[PDB]
């Protein structure tokens with residue numbers, strides 16, 4: 001396949017992106033990978049920019065709505081799809097490679113060999129959806145194998161995901177560095193997500209409570225962990241038809257001092273996640 | 283700041299990161315890295331794998347030895363085969379975080395070998411994935427003796443999009459056809475005499491196969507039937523990927539049996555018609 005530099009090159013075949021990737025690496029360029037599910041927004045763009053700023057980089061953005069991380073009924077047919085836009089944003093960012101595989105090319109033998117996560121996959125987000133992270137890690141492994149990048153980028157918004165990815169990478173000895181990138185927020189603090197378009201004016205207004213509780217907790221934390229949790233709790237209780245799924249304070253690896261506070265809540269049918277770093281006593 | 287590597291010599295590394303560094307540096311200088319994963323206690327069967335890997339123009343041979351949960355003799359054979367890298371890591375080096383993320387095999391891992399040991403191949407594929415990631419060879423060598431295993435590794439490679447050729451090396455046998463294995467040494471003399479029936483039965487079957495699949499199966503069974511003290515766990519004809527037997531065409535006939543406490547396996551290629 002052709003590679004036209006300083007331009008967006010779009011490959012659909014794993015073979016084609018694998019060949020270009022390998023060729024670019026043998027020419028000294030450093031391969032950056034940003035796995036996305038499309039519907040790009042400014043949170044994905046921060047990920048591209050981090051990769052862009054790595055000296056000698058050639059950036060691969062992949063776009064694949066992976067039917068293995070979704071479960072019935074349900075969420076798969078409803079995922080936002082906007083490839084036109086996505087590709088334009090990527091041209092505008094000066095990304096050179098977009099990898100957009102077909103389901104058939106990724107799953108020619110269906111679900112056969114898969115990745116089985118550690119017990120962290122059974123908690124938090126994986127509580128209701130116990131096969132969700134196995135689907136995520138399977139496609140992430142396939143993607144790293146196809147593209148073999150130097151580094152791979154993930155937002156901290158999906159913190160649990162990032163942690164399991166660091167697990168996949170360590171546990172399977174993958175020669176790739178995992179770059180966590182801080183969450184991009186709207187001007188009021190709402191963590192940017194494509195699930196956000198599904199909020200109406202009211203819920204969009206109520207939605208600010210997640211970030212506010214979290215940031216309230218981050219500051220109340222000098223008074224310790226009960227104080228941080230109770231502060232976030234209070235903010236969430238004062239917010240109209242925000243229904244809290246969970247609100248949990250964990251170690252940063254997700255097992256006082258330094259931790260991570262995590263929230264999941266529904267607004268109508270729209271499930272939102274957010275998290276923040278927490279220093280207990282600091 | 284790469285670890286020390288002396289060409290034409292046996293270099294031993296126990297650190298994953300060391301063998302990863304050497305291997306990467308060697309490929310840049312135009313050697314082709316060949317991996318031969320072993321579990322130690324090398325016999326001729328392992329040596330046939332090593333020899334295949336040496337055949338490749340440009341090869342540097344990496345032999346891992348690791349027991350998945352003979353030290354000086356094994357290395358002496360490797361030095362004697364002219365192998366240049368052994369990878370002899372600890373359990374803690376390979377599993378510093380315990381069993382956390384693992385490989386889940388497809389349904390074939392539940393059959394055959396299979397039913398007695400339901401989690402065996404999960405262990406196998408996981409460790410093999412890791413060796414592949416550590417060493418990143420161009421080619422990886424497995425004996426056909428453990429044929430279900432080879433099939434499942436080929437599935438790993440395909441399914442996870444791994445950049446490596448799987449090379450399957452024919453079974454080394456003793457003079458009477460008994461598939462070589464470190465277990466063979468446990469057999470008393472009666473058992474060792476009766477153990478010839480597994481290969482005997484498989485080669486009878488392979489030759490009976492001009493008459494079709496039932497004649498092959500029946501010739502194999504007659505031969506096992508004529509052996510005392512041989513408990514047959516399965517005798518099965520499958521296609522070459524271990525799916526069900528197609529009506530004509532290439533297949534594989536596999537057998538497992540228990541002789542006292544010692545469990546023996548064998549397998550053969552079959553052409554129906």
Ligand SMILES: O=C(O)c1cc2ccccc2o1
Pocket residue numbers: 035036037038136139140161
């Ligand atoms: O668009 C995203 O937020 C995204 C996509 C994606 C693909 C595989 C694993 C994790 C992922 O996060």
Ligand SMILES: O=C(O)c1cc2ccccc2o1
Pocket residue numbers: 319320321322406409410
């Ligand atoms: O000694 C062997 O035949 C052997 C070694 C090995 C290592 C990983 C997976 C399977 C394996 O078989």
